[PDB]
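Write out the bound-state structure for sodium ion.
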Amino acid sequence: GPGTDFVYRVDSRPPEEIFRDGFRSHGFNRNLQQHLRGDSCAAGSRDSAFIATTTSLIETYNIARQYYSSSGFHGRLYRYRIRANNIFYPIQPSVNYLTQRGITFSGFERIMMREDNDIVAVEHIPGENIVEAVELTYDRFNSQVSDGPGTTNARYVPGSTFVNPGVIPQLVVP
Ligand SMILES: NC(=O)c1ccc[n+]([C@@H]2O[C@H](COP(=O)([O-])OP(=O)(O)OC[C@H]3O[C@@H](n4cnc5c(N)ncnc54)[C@H](O)[C@@H]3O)[C@@H](O)[C@H]2O)c1
Ligand code: NA
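---
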């Protein structure tokens, strides 16, 4: 309904798995800077506490392009639309908190976070939060990403819910 926070996630797993199981984080590592760099995700230590999402549809195409054009990447990508709730945190309050704690974000990191569309979910997004999926198509010759077939999650639970506006609890502060 009106006002509800929705986010997107690009993932290689298909709706049949994801609508049923939802998303689960790699692990329980709450080092946010590590996560935001990608160091604790699939290409890294694979123990991130967080599940990455974005508010920006425009950003999802670019994320998908990055994955599609990487060497050894095969298979498909889907854009999931997700209802956000108190499991979801915009990163800015936490970045501000880490900064007050003496953690340094480089000029480059701050440029990457500039548009403020990043939202992380902690531990688990239920299948019932996921509205729908769209298979993404890739034309490697013109670096073009478009929407393929869409699928609706019949198990979606409607409601008007919002992100947690605060700092992520139990953050790791080295
Ligand atoms: N994916 C997004 O929509 C998205 C949005 C905003 C920012 N980012 C940034 O991209 C970087 C990587 O994020 P990501 O979410 O793509 O990495 P990720 O490790 O969460 O996902 C990459 C792939 O790993 C697999 N995967 C993820 N979790 C799994 C699990 N628990 N069990 C088995 N397989 C799993 C899936 O193939 C997934 O597509 C981070 O810096 C992140 O903040 C991603
Ligand atoms: Na709080």
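---
The first helix runs from residue 15 to 21.
The longest strand covers residues 130-139.
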